[PDB]
Design an enzyme around this catalytic site. Structure first.
Site, PDB file in Angstrom:
ATOM      1  N   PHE A  25      -6.840 -14.571 -10.228  1.00 20.86           N
ATOM      2  CA  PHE A  25      -6.871 -13.287  -9.534  1.00 20.86           C
ATOM      3  C   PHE A  25      -6.767 -12.126 -10.514  1.00 20.86           C
ATOM      4  O   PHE A  25      -7.453 -11.110 -10.352  1.00 20.86           O
ATOM      5  CB  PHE A  25      -5.746 -13.217  -8.505  1.00 20.86           C
ATOM      6  CG  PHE A  25      -6.172 -13.591  -7.116  1.00 20.86           C
ATOM      7  CD1 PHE A  25      -7.202 -12.906  -6.487  1.00 20.86           C
ATOM      8  CD2 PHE A  25      -5.541 -14.622  -6.436  1.00 20.86           C
ATOM      9  CE1 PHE A  25      -7.597 -13.246  -5.210  1.00 20.86           C
ATOM     10  CE2 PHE A  25      -5.932 -14.967  -5.158  1.00 20.86           C
ATOM     11  CZ  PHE A  25      -6.959 -14.277  -4.545  1.00 20.86           C
ATOM     12  N   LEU A  28     -10.101 -11.739 -12.141  1.00 19.16           N
ATOM     13  CA  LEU A  28     -11.041 -11.088 -11.230  1.00 19.16           C
ATOM     14  C   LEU A  28     -10.771  -9.591 -11.114  1.00 19.16           C
ATOM     15  O   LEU A  28     -11.715  -8.794 -11.032  1.00 19.16           O
ATOM     16  CB  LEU A  28     -10.984 -11.744  -9.851  1.00 19.16           C
ATOM     17  CG  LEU A  28     -12.166 -12.633  -9.453  1.00 19.16           C
ATOM     18  CD1 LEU A  28     -12.417 -13.715 -10.492  1.00 19.16           C
ATOM     19  CD2 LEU A  28     -11.946 -13.240  -8.073  1.00 19.16           C
ATOM     20  N   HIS A  29      -9.493  -9.187 -11.126  1.00 25.83           N
ATOM     21  CA  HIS A  29      -9.167  -7.766 -11.018  1.00 25.83           C
ATOM     22  C   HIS A  29      -9.589  -7.005 -12.268  1.00 25.83           C
ATOM     23  O   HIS A  29     -10.150  -5.905 -12.175  1.00 25.83           O
ATOM     24  CB  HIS A  29      -7.669  -7.556 -10.776  1.00 25.83           C
ATOM     25  CG  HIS A  29      -7.216  -7.920  -9.401  1.00 25.83           C
ATOM     26  ND1 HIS A  29      -7.742  -7.344  -8.266  1.00 25.83           N
ATOM     27  CD2 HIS A  29      -6.222  -8.739  -8.979  1.00 25.83           C
ATOM     28  CE1 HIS A  29      -7.135  -7.843  -7.201  1.00 25.83           C
ATOM     29  NE2 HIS A  29      -6.204  -8.686  -7.606  1.00 25.83           N
ATOM     30  N   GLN A  30      -9.342  -7.584 -13.449  1.00 28.11           N
ATOM     31  CA  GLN A  30      -9.768  -6.900 -14.665  1.00 28.11           C
ATOM     32  C   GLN A  30     -11.282  -6.959 -14.841  1.00 28.11           C
ATOM     33  O   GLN A  30     -11.867  -6.032 -15.410  1.00 28.11           O
ATOM     34  CB  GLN A  30      -9.040  -7.454 -15.892  1.00 28.11           C
ATOM     35  CG  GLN A  30      -9.292  -8.906 -16.232  1.00 28.11           C
ATOM     36  CD  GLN A  30      -8.540  -9.326 -17.479  1.00 28.11           C
ATOM     37  OE1 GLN A  30      -8.048  -8.486 -18.231  1.00 28.11           O
ATOM     38  NE2 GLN A  30      -8.428 -10.628 -17.697  1.00 28.11           N
ATOM     39  N   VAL A  33     -12.442  -4.110 -12.576  1.00 29.66           N
ATOM     40  CA  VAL A  33     -12.185  -2.796 -13.164  1.00 29.66           C
ATOM     41  C   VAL A  33     -13.029  -2.606 -14.426  1.00 29.66           C
ATOM     42  O   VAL A  33     -13.246  -1.472 -14.869  1.00 29.66           O
ATOM     43  CB  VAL A  33     -10.675  -2.585 -13.427  1.00 29.66           C
ATOM     44  CG1 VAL A  33     -10.222  -3.241 -14.720  1.00 29.66           C
ATOM     45  CG2 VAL A  33     -10.319  -1.099 -13.423  1.00 29.66           C
TER      46      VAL A  33
END
Lengths: 187, 293
Positions: A25, A28-30, A33
């Site tokens: 997760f 996926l977030h980085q 972004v």
């Protein structure tokens, strides 16, 4: 969306799978972004609402070009031996639709104390008598513990899967990729 | 003939404590004045250790010793059981050396698994191993840990040279002292993962570090012979082979895979088991413990 990708986690004993889904997760977030976009959704087909668990399989929702742009970046490095991959598939028909949402509550109200005293500049007894500690809400949603890059802290981000709809309309997804109006096919 | 009431085996293969120092890449062979990661307390009260602002690599230093003579116990009661055990391990060591065990151990030493949380998500990692015979260094290995995965023990020439050095140690023919240095390209400003106390980070004097037993539990993760499944990979070799994270008991004694069952069938009941089970048995004897009542 039109295309989906299910990557399956490798069975790992020496790390419990909640930590692997945590670092997936965070990856996926980085990645979101780093690249951007507002029409990238997530789904997890193996939700057990009874035990508030997410499962073993996760599913991203984007177009074909965003999918093969996601598989053409070094965010896959170091963990190819740590999970299995998928293939750019077409969504079957028909499939119902639902949500993904981060629900936070006033779990321990000291943040509300400090915000209320940064705003009101009143006494601490006023913040004690105004709102009690019974405002702490309890959640039966699946949660995932993420760290940070700047303000490093372990926090559980809850996962709420919405009700089962039939038609998906226009809507976006934030920098965390959760449903802010955008619907995802559940199948 | 029966077992001894108490029986204890001193460990061979003693690691050290791994202190962590920081610096930037391309000084990977100029790493002598690198300052170390100091720990700081922010806010409940939580201790925290971060990489410095202008450095992306971490220097991890510990030391290994190989002792040998792994068949002799440190305490034993009756001599018949001791001599039976000694002739059993004599037949094992003269049928076959420590070569498969040293191969698996050098394989586990080559990849940097001993950074437990500190391995995943790294750009480039590389180990550097020095043999120190006298006060000077006598030989040098070099392995990229990204080349060797966590799923299989592979084959290589320099890995075989390391494995014959380790098997030379375990045979008792020489003394082995190894300095192990690791580097890891991760980035700047990220949090490091030293050992957690009972919340405080484990520290040597103004430097965060790693327990010796974490390095030891990493270095004995060679048990690929679980009876139920084997897609799980390798296991830290332990009697009643289990895992504190997943929480399950492989080689459970309802099956005939428990370490003591293999032991009293080999020594007392005189039924020698399969050769990979014998390798697991000698690995558990390398690990050491309390055996008896």
């Amino acid at each position: 969306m039109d295309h989906y990708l299910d990557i399956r986690l490798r069975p790992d004993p020496e790390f419990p799978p909640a930590q692997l889904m945590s670092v997936l997760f965070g990856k996926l977030h980085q990645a979101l972004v780093a690249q951007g976009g507002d029409r990238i959704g997530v789904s997890f087909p193996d939700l057990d609402e009874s035990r508030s668990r997410l499962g073993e399989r996760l599913r991203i929702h984007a177009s074909a070009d965003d999918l093969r742009a996601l598989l053409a970046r070094p965010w896959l490095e170091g963990l190819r031996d740590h999970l299995q991959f998928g293939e750019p598939a077409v969504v079957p028909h028909p499939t119902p639709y639902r949500q993904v949402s981060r629900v936070q509550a006033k779990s321990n109200p000291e943040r509300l104390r400090r915000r209320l005293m940064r705003r009101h500049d009143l006494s601490e007894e006023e913040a004690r008598k105004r709102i009690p500690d019974t405002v702490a809400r309890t959640l039966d949603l699946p949660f995932v513990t993420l760290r940070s890059q700047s303000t490093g802290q372990h926090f559980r981000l809850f996962i709420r899967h919405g009700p089962l709809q039939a038609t998906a309309e226009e809507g976006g997804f934030t920098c965390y990729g959760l449903s802010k109006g955008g619907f995802v096919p559940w199948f | 003939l029966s077992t001894a009431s108490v029986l204890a085996f001193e460990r061979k293969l003693d690691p050290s404590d791994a202190l962590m120092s920081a610096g930037a890449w391309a000084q990977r062979d100029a790493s002598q004045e690198w300052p170390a990661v100091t720990v700081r307390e922010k806010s409940q009260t939580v201790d925290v250790a971060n990489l410095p602002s202008d450095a992306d690599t971490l220097k991890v230093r510990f030391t290994l010793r190989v002792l040998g003579g792994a068949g002799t116990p440190s305490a034993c009661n009756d001599a018949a059981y001791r001599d039976k055990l000694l002739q059993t391990v004599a037949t094992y060591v003269n049928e076959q050396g420590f070569a498969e065990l040293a191969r698996r151990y050098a394989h586990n030493l080559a990849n940097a698994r001993f950074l437990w949380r500190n391995r995943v998500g790294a750009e480039a990692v590389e180990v550097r191993i020095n043999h120190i015979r006298q006060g000077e260094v006598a030989r040098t290995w070099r392995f990229d840990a990204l080349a060797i995965g966590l799923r299989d023990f592979k084959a290589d020439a320099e890995l075989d040279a390391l494995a014959e050095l380790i098997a030379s140690g375990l045979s008792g023919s020489g003394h082995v002292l190894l300095e192990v240095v690791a580097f890891a390209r991760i980035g700047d400003g990220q949090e490091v993962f030293p050992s957690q106390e009972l919340k405080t980070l484990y520290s040597v004097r103004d430097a965060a570090a790693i327990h010796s037993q974490k390095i030891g539990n990493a270095l004995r993760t060679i048990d690929t012979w679980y009876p139920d499944e084997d897609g799980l990979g390798p296991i830290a070799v332990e009697p009643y082979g289990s895992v504190t994270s997943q929480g399950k008991a492989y080689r459970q004694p309802k099956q005939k895979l428990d370490f003591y069952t293999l032991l009293d069938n080999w020594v007392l009941r005189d039924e020698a088991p399969a050769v990979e089970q014998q390798h697991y048995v000698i690995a558990n004897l390398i690990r050491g413990g309390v055996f008896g009542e």
